[PDB]
Design a protein around this ligand. Structure first.
Ligand SMILES: CCCCCCCCCCCCCCCCCC(=O)OC[C@H](COP(=O)([O-])OCC(O)COP(=O)([O-])OC[C@@H](COC(=O)CCCCCCCCCCCCCCCCC)OC(=O)CCCCCCCCCCCCCCCCC)OC(=O)CCCCCCCCCCCCCCCCC
Ligand SMILES: CCCCCCCCCCCCCCCCCC(=O)OC[C@H](COP(=O)([O-])OCC(O)COP(=O)([O-])OC[C@@H](COC(=O)CCCCCCCCCCCCCCCCC)OC(=O)CCCCCCCCCCCCCCCCC)OC(=O)CCCCCCCCCCCCCCCCC
Ligand SMILES: CCCCCCCCCCCCCCCCCC(=O)OC[C@H](COP(=O)([O-])OCC(O)COP(=O)([O-])OC[C@@H](COC(=O)CCCCCCCCCCCCCCCCC)OC(=O)CCCCCCCCCCCCCCCCC)OC(=O)CCCCCCCCCCCCCCCCC
Ligand SMILES: CCCCCCCCCCCCCCCCC[C@@H](O)O[C@H](CO[C@H](O)CCCCCCCCCCCCCCC)COP(=O)(O)OCC[N+](C)(C)C
Ligand SMILES: CCCCCCCCCCCCCCCCC[C@@H](O)O[C@H](CO[C@H](O)CCCCCCCCCCCCCCC)COP(=O)(O)OCC[N+](C)(C)C
Ligand SMILES: CCCCCCCCCCCCCCCCC[C@@H](O)O[C@H](CO[C@H](O)CCCCCCCCCCCCCCC)COP(=O)(O)OCC[N+](C)(C)C
Ligand SMILES: CCCCCCCC/C=C\CCCCCCCC(=O)OC[C@H](COP(=O)(O)OCCN)OC(=O)CCCCCCC/C=C\CCCCCCCC
Ligand SMILES: CCCCCCCC/C=C\CCCCCCCC(=O)O[C@H](COC(=O)CCCCCCC/C=C/CCCCCCCC)COP(=O)(O)OCCN
Lengths: 115, 83, 175, 171, 347, 122, 71, 105, 98
């Protein structure tokens, strides 16, 4: 309830700042002024054209590696269990396979951006 | 004996970060199995009373079970305060 | 009925689902899924699952960043579509909103059976536990028991993630 | 499927222990040391009967014993105890760690006024035995009679008469 | 692809199937399906050739949709009973969702559209694996939950699969699409008897698997994926076409061949349950499969098609790599009817 | 439905329970075993045919292994099948014994007392 | 001590709800007052809709979301 | 189909997580531990067909604990009658149901 | 069932419907797959929290993990298709017929 009030307050303040920014000054909008910026000359093509990703395989890999932090985040609570020998074996097993995943991608040239 | 030394020298000269990370990971894997304190941690995790200790019904032949918390029978935590 | 917070959050969840289920430009679709993830995090927080809600919100923020990056490369479509830019997308969005409002109205003041069972409302506060004890979080202990009880689960999950790295590297190889 | 039996409002009447949480935590260790027998009797009843309606009289004795305990503290040294729980109350987490001087003053009062010894680390969490005249409940789950099992397999195994018997096969 | 990587992907596919087969918890069965699909996708793309990419994408979309409905059914069942064990599926809406998800995974009609396309788009080894190993996990799940299965829905999909496989096979010149439609029809036969007797389902699966393995290995031996390409084999290896003709006749279900045993065993079972119209329609519909097997037999073995001059060069070379289990598979797919009573060892 | 999948006391992956030892083993001259050996011999002949070797006399060690493996597997297959049919018979007889009111013994009339309709052929 | 007081608090709330049910449903055709919904006769922990059903929204909100919302 | 290697080897790969009455961490019980325990015990070993008919009382109680449908129906029937009785005005709910109670510890 | 459960189930149904009714972009369908996963996560978490099944608290996390493997798989395929056509339109996947 307090956090909801905090979020509402922050968003309201930011929106009021935008509203003041758009309603206080004098606006003289014309076609030359609102045209896209590309250093003084008109743009050649559209900015909505396909823009190649050279790190596409790292981006897919980041999806799997990001899910492994979800598996490792409860580790502080897992250290409170009585089966510390089983727990430590599982924690290290997950980090070793995580490192092995990185080793496989690294050696097979997966971390290099496409040219 | 002689190949591994040259390999280690070359790795330390070119990729010290990988040598440091592999050494730290190897120590992290190995050392817990050789430590006397690893048992103590388990014992500490066993001494933490998260839930209520439900009393037993005294059947008359339960010598090692205490009748009062301050009675000498039962588990002791003297090893913990001196640690 | 109290403050209608959970019902409002679930309604916003459904509205976000309708937004990305309309199949407009992916940039917009990604935004609708982010809204749904945040609101579902709020729903789970309102039930005592702080860790699960925060984890799902974080995971979907990362996934939607990757999806945005992929959309700018392979799903660009020079005039990208917003919900009001095309009759099909707007029609699907309006159909979703109308169907959700119809279901809510039919289940709210009266008690209809739709597919499985019925509902009278009463607010979701009714079905709670009343349990009073604890120096820990039950949800946290349940999640942490993965490393002592769920050894088999850890094994299969870790193997699947390693294989996923190998598989993505095999698929995109080409040649 | 039947009316739920409930106690009357009068059976639920008892002299309340109207001290605050910090007051209870300041006296918690000595209280657990001194009022252990009725407390353990009530907890054994509660965990054996699985029904709050069957252990009201033991809860009343728990309240009565807590009243006697607090009556002894107020009668012998209320000052030292009051300085101890007031210091404990200030903390947002109600920490024992922050009030060790006040705790010493209270412990040394109760040691010579009443001979009370503060339990050591590990003692209040022991599992203890309880002597009780309350009979052990027979069917606390109110279980129905379990259905009888399918009978058994008995006898020796003989080859199937005239083999497999599948259509034309003679074996 | 590296041979070690191929080997470990094959082991992961098999491990997912076995995880489904040994699990008592629904979540582990779902995990087994996910693990199977994850390693299955790169096997379909082993040769790049964009048709393989298309087949892999279609297969992934179908199987991911089926997995989602399967998970939803698991969760509904859990909601209506705090149970994770695979059992008779306490909720009927959950049961319908589960049956539809498994029918999508197997490719039963009307979820059958993907099988011909994916099979045509992948290689013959990938097709062999897809049409033999991939059926084990869903059928093993269906055997377990068979008691709670609604007969009207399952039998409707079974009849639809038999009809659609028979009709679709008639129009095909490509061998992989013929195999796919044959697979759809045999899946329908398997699932028609499932609510009555799971031992008959297992028996039909085993006989279909040996027949499919023999047929796919004979098509790998003679590198033919079209009818006209297979029509050249009489002029290079007549024995292969003769064994192919006998295997096709067995797949048709003609007595005294091995193919006949499952149908004979299913019809009988359905007659003990007072089902007469259903087996009669299924048996009469299987004649479409027999027709388009007979047409292939006419093309490859019972007549001689014109050949080419360069075939002469092929007369000077031998098949280098040999499939050791092909002879056993052929004999098992043809000459096994006299040992029908041994089916009692499957229960 | 699985008729005997969950029979009480059943060991999960045994293939041959101990009680099956109470049954007479199949004879080594069992006609079913001879048919398994014939299947192995046919597998060996087809192996020679596909490999383009003299069909009848190419590899006698390989043909012998085919026959021996088929016979060896068939022996245990026959043992399991016979045991499973014996179990079916045992359970059916025990159930008939334990449910007399469901299988009532009926005194049978003679054909002199039964009245069958006569349908002339003409 | 806390368990002893919690038992009495829950029981008193249930009894008060029973006394109000006896009055509200006096003239409902065949309503059995205080009738359980379970076949079994053993104790069942109340659902918080059974304890706070006839009470104000403030205490209902505090009993449902008080601990979760406290920051 | 199901190859019960867990039963054969006594391995317990996933049976620890099948039911809610099976050895939770810190002995935290499920909301319906008694109901599921009674239902499981009643139906143990009699087979699925027999259990469905003979343990229907236990299973119905367990389902009532799980979803509490009858409890919500009863509470709704209580509050609808109370609303009707107050709208025309002859109930006057007691002061301890309006916030004027003297709370107990 | 309360209104929240039906809202979650309706969200799943809307996502499944969204997946089934294809428009043009492949990525639009991968997003509906992700939405179906999110709806399942919320539904199972609500059921698990409500009944206080402590061990089951780890299963949604597991459910999340295989959600990523399925997404990463799909995106991988979306790359190859795009590399063939310069477009992720599902109309291009028409080389194989029924
Ligand atoms: C070397 C020869 C040798 O050592 O043989 C000893 C062996 C000793 O036989 P026996 O037990 O003393 O004589 C029993 C009689 O045959 C008396 O016969 P039986 O009562 O022992 O019969 C065994 C039984 C079971 O036998 C079988 O199922 C296999 C028999 C071969 C089936 C026919 C096709 C193969 C030729 O046969 C049948 O059930 C009859 C049905 C046969 C048709 C099965 C379905 C296929 C029909 C056609 C399609 O004789 C043979 O093996 C004969 C050749 C086989
Ligand atoms: C009811 C009772 C009856 C039940 C019936 C059950 C079902 C019956 C069968 C059902 C249908 C089976 C269909 C099989 C399709 C296979 C597809 C295939 O392989 O292609 C065809 C293949 C085509 O060959 P090709 O195209 O001429 O060759 C070119 C190459 O492909 C060109 O490729 P390349 O150049 O890359 O060559 C590499 C090559 C060469 O190989 C190598 O160089 C070896 C290299 C070694 C690398 C080591 C890597 C180790 C690291 C990886 C570790 C992975 C761990 C995964 C586990 C994770 C667990 C979390 O490797 C291969 O070709 C394939 C390797 C196969 C590996 C098998 C892995 C088995 C995994 C077992 C999983 C279960 C484990 C327990 C799980 C428990 C639950 C968790 O030829 C055949 O396979 C003909 C068909 C063979 C079927 C066999 C007949 C059925 C079985 C009969 C025996 C008895 C069965 C019953 C046993 C009863 C229990 C005792
Ligand atoms: C109830 C039934 C009871 C009995 C069952 C009988 C049924 C058959 C038996 C069971 C299955 C047998 C399978 C193994 C044979 C496969 C080998 C093979 O292919 O043959 C070639 C081979 C000739 O090769 P070669 O002589 O080395 O040199 C010439 C070149 O190879 C030159 O060769 P090529 O390749 O250059 O020639 C080209 C030719 C090559 O094409 C072929 O070779 C055709 C092979 C047929 C494939 C068999 C499929 C698998 C079995 C299924 C049978 C289904 C049975 C149900 C009824 C339906 C029948 C279709 O292609 C064509 O001519 C195109 C014509 C297309 C017509 C389509 C019809 C084909 C299917 C008909 C199968 C009928 C049975 C076959 C009879 C054996 C031959 O034939 C043989 O020599 C072996 C035949 C049998 C050996 C007998 C040795 C035993 C010695 C006596 C022991 C005495 C016992 C008692 C002891 C006590 C005495 C005192
Ligand atoms: C720090 C964060 C918190 C800030 C706290 C204060 C919040 C400030 C509010 C934010 C808005 C700042 C805008 C300040 C300038 C006023 C702009 C606008 O509101 O005034 C005119 C509003 O007038 C409109 O023409 C409409 C007038 C009437 C029509 C509808 C209004 C009906 C209200 C009835 C009024 C009659 C008397 C009411 C007495 C109470 C619009 O004129 P316009 O040129 O476009 O905008 C450019 C303004 N310029 C000229 C200064 C550059
Ligand atoms: C028979 C099969 C052998 C050959 C085939 C291999 C295929 C299987 C893959 C690996 C098999 C291991 C699975 C065994 C199940 C684990 C659970 C059991 O063994 O006990 C655990 C023992 O776990 C230990 O950590 C040792 C086993 C861990 C093995 C390390 C992982 C290596 C797996 C590598 C193969 C998997 C695929 C490839 C990945 C690289 C924990 O028990 P514990 O905690 O006392 O008590 C729990 C009960 N409590 C909670 C109520 C108290
Ligand atoms: C075309 C003919 C079919 C060919 C089949 C392949 C031939 C090779 C045989 C495969 C070798 C493995 C089987 C024997 C090894 C050990 C078996 C044991 O470990 O498993 C037992 C199982 O034993 C097997 O089921 C018996 C395998 C025998 C297969 C042959 C039957 C073929 C049907 C008759 C057609 C004629 C074939 C004659 C061959 C020439 C455990 O029983 P259970 O775990 O409780 O049942 C699991 C399934 N349930 C619970 C759902 C029922
Ligand atoms: C976040 C940190 C800062 C937050 C912002 C706080 C700003 C407070 C100080 C504002 C100073 C006053 C604003 C004056 C500038 C507004 C724009 C402007 O100058 O326009 C002048 C314009 C000239 O136009 P014309 O003469 O009609 O013809 C021109 C067409 N050819 O004349 C005007 O409109 C002026 C009208 C009075 C402005 C109102 C000022 C009131 C104070 C604003 C406080 C904002 C609170 C919200
Ligand atoms: C026993 C525990 C093991 C696990 C614990 C470690 C935790 C995680 C650590 C590893 C994470 C993943 C490592 C990824 C491996 C990278 C492989 C690789 O690609 O290496 C090459 C380089 O080659 C190497 O691998 C570097 C040297 C070999 C590995 C490093 C040393 C191996 C072990 C050394 C320490 C052993 C213990 C110390 C002994 C102390 C001496 C007595 C990369 O360089 P390039 O990108 O090609 O450079 C191009 C620009 N010039």
């Amino acid at each position: 309830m307090n956090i909801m009030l905090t979020l509402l307050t922050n968003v309201t303040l930011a929106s009021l700042l935008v509203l003041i920014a758009f309603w206080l000054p004098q606006l003289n909008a014309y076609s030359e002024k609102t045209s896209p910026y590309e250093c003084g000359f008109d743009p050649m093509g559209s900015a909505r054209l396909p823009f190649s990703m050279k790190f596409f395989l790292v981006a897919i890999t980041f999806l799997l590696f990001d899910l492994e932090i979800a598996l490792l985040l409860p580790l502080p609570w897992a250290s409170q269990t009585n089966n510390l020998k089983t727990m430590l074996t599982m924690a290290l097993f997950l980090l070793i396979l995580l490192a092995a995943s990185l080793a496989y991608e690294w050696t097979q040239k997966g971390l290099e951006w496409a040219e | 004996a002689g190949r591994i030394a040259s390999f280690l020298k070359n790795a330390w000269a070119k990729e010290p970060v990988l040598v440091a990370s592999f050494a730290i990971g190897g120590l992290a894997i190995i050392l817990p199995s050789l430590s006397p304190y690893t048992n103590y941690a388990i014992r500490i995790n066993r001494a933490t009373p998260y839930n209520y200790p439900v009393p037993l019904r005294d059947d008359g032949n339960m010598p090692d079970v205490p009748s009062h918390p301050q009675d000498p029978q039962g588990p002791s935590l003297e090893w913990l305060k001196n640690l | 009925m109290t403050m209608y917070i959970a019902f409002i959050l679930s309604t916003i969840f459904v509205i976000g689902f309708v937004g990305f289920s309309s199949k407009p430009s992916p940039i917009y679709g990604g935004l609708g899924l982010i809204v749904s993830g945040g609101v579902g995090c709020g729903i789970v927080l309102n039930f005592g699952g702080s860790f699960l809600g925060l984890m799902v919100f974080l995971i979907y923020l990362g996934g939607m960043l990757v999806v945005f990056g992929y959309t700018t490369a392979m799903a660009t479509e020079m005039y990208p579509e917003v919900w009001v830019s095309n009759k099909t997308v707007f029609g699907a969005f309006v159909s979703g909103l109308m169907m959700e409002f119809c279901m809510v109205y039919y289940a709210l003041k009266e008690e209809e059976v739709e597919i499985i069972f019925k509902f009278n409302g009463l607010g979701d506060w009714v079905i709670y536990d009343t349990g009073d004890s604890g120096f820990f979080s039950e949800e946290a202990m349940g999640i942490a028991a993965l490393y002592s009880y769920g050894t088999w689960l850890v094994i299969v999950t870790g193997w699947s993630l390693l294989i996923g790295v190998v598989v993505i590297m095999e698929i995109t190889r080409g040649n | 499927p039947g009316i739920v039996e409930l106690p009357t409002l009068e059976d639920l009447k008892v002299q309340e222990v109207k001290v605050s949480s910090s007051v209870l935590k300041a006296a918690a260790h000595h209280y657990g040391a001194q009022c252990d027998k009725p407390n353990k009797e009530f907890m054994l009843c509660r965990w054996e009967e699985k029904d709050p309606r069957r252990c009201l009289e033991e809860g009343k004795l728990v309240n009565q014993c807590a009243l006697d305990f607090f009556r002894q503290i107020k009668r012998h040294c209320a000052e030292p105890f009051t300085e101890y729980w007031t210091c404990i109350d200030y903390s947002g987490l109600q920490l024992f760690r922050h009030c060790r001087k006040q705790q010493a003053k209270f412990d040394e009062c109760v040691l010579d006024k009443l001979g009370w010894v503060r339990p050591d680390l590990g003692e209040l969490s022991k599992v203890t035995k309880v002597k009780t005249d309350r009979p052990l409940p027979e069917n606390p789950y109110h279980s129905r009679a379990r259905p009888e099992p399918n009978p058994e397999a008995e006898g020796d195994l003989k080859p199937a008469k005239h083999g497999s018997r599948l259509f034309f096969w003679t074996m | 692809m590296n041979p070690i990587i191929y080997t470990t992907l094959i082991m992961t596919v098999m491990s997912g199937t076995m995880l489904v087969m040994i699990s008592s918890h629904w979540l582990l069965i779902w995990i087994g399906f996910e693990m199977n699909l994850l390693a299955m996708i790169p096997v379909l793309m082993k040769n790049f050739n964009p048709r393989a990419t298309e087949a892999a994408t279609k297969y992934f979309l179908t199987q991911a949709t089926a997995s989602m409905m399967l998970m939803m059914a698991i969760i509904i069942n859990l909601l209506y009973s705090g149970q994770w064990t695979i059992t008779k599926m306490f909720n009927p809406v959950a049961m319908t969702m589960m049956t539809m998800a498994l029918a999508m995974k197997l490719g039963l009609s009307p979820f059958h559209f993907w099988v011909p396309e994916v099979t045509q788009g992948i290689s013959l080894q990938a097709g062999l694996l897809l049409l033999t190993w991939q059926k084990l996990a869903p059928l093993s799940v269906l055997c377990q939950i068979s008691q709670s299965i609604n007969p009207n829905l399952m039998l409707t999909m079974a009849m639809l699969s038999i009809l659609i496989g028979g009709w679709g096979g008639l129009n095909q010149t490509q061998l992989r699409k013929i195999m796919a439609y044959s697979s759809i029809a045999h899946m329908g036969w398997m699932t028609a008897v499932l609510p009555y007797n799971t031992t008959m389902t297992i028996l039909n699966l085993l006989i279909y698997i040996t027949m499919t393995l023999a047929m796919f290995m004979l098509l790998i031996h003679s590198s033919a994926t079209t009818t006209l390409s297979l029509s050249h084999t009489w002029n290079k290896m007549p024995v292969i076409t003769s064994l192919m003709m006998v295997t096709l006749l067995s797949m048709g279900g003609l007595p005294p061949l091995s193919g006949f045993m499952p149908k004979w065993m299913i019809i009988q079972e359905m007659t003990k349950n007072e089902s007469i119209i259903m087996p009669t329609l299924m048996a009469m519909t299987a004649l479409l499969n027999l027709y388009f097997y007979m047409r292939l037999a006419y093309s490859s073995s019972l007549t001689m098609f014109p050949s080419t001059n360069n075939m002469k060069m092929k007369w000077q070379f031998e098949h280098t790599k040999q499939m050791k289990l092909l002879p056993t598979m052929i004999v098992l797919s043809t000459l096994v009817l006299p040992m029908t009573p041994a089916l009692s060892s499957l229960n | 439905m699985t008729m005997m999948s969950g029979r009480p006391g059943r060991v999960p992956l045994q293939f041959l329970p101990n009680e099956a030892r109470s049954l007479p083993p199949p004879k080594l001259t069992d006609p079913r075993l001879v048919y398994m050996g014939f299947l192995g011999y046919c597998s060996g002949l087809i192996d020679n045919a596909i490999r383009r070797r003299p069909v009848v006399s190419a590899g006698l060690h390989r043909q012998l292994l085919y026959v021996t493996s088929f016979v060896f597997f068939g022996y245990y297959l026959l043992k399991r099948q016979d045991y499973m049919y014996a179990l079916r018979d045992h359970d059916m007889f025990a159930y008939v014994k334990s449910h007399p009111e469901d299988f009532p013994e009926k005194d049978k009339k003679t054909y002199g007392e039964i009245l069958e309709e006569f349908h002339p052929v003409r | 001590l806390f368990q002893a007081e919690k038992d009495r608090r829950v029981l008193q709330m249930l009894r008060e709800n029973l006394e109000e049910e006896a009055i509200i449903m006096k003239d409902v055709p065949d309503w059995k007052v205080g009738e359980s919904v379970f076949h079994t006769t053993r104790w069942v922990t109340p659902m918080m809709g059974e304890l706070y059903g006839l009470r104000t929204n403030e205490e209902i909100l505090s009993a449902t979301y008080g601990f979760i919302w406290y920051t | 189909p199901f190859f019960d290697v867990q039963k054969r080897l006594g391995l317990d790969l996933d049976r620890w997580m099948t039911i809610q009455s099976a050895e939770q961490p810190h002995k935290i019980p499920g909301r319906c531990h008694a109901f599921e325990k009674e239902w499981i015990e009643c139906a143990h070993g009699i087979g699925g067909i027999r259990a469905e008919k003979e343990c229907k009382i236990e299973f119905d109680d367990f389902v009532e604990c799980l979803l509490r449908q009858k409890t919500m129906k009863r509470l709704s029937a209580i509050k609808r009658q109370r609303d009707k009785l107050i709208k025309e005005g002859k109930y006057t709910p007691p002061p301890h149901h309006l916030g004027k109670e003297d709370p107990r510890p | 069932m309360p209104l929240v459960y039906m809202n979650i189930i309706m969200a799943f149904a809307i996502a499944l419907a969204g997946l089934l009714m294809y428009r043009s972009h492949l990525m639009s369908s991968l997003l509906c797959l992700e939405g179906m996963m999110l709806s399942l996560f919320i539904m199972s978490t609500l059921i698990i929290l409500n009944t206080h099944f402590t061990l089951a608290n780890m299963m949604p996390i597991i459910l999340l993990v295989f959600a990523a493997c399925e997404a990463a798989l799909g995106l991988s395929l979306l790359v190859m298709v795009s590399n063939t056509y310069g477009t992720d339109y599902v109309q291009n996947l028409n080389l194989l017929q029924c």
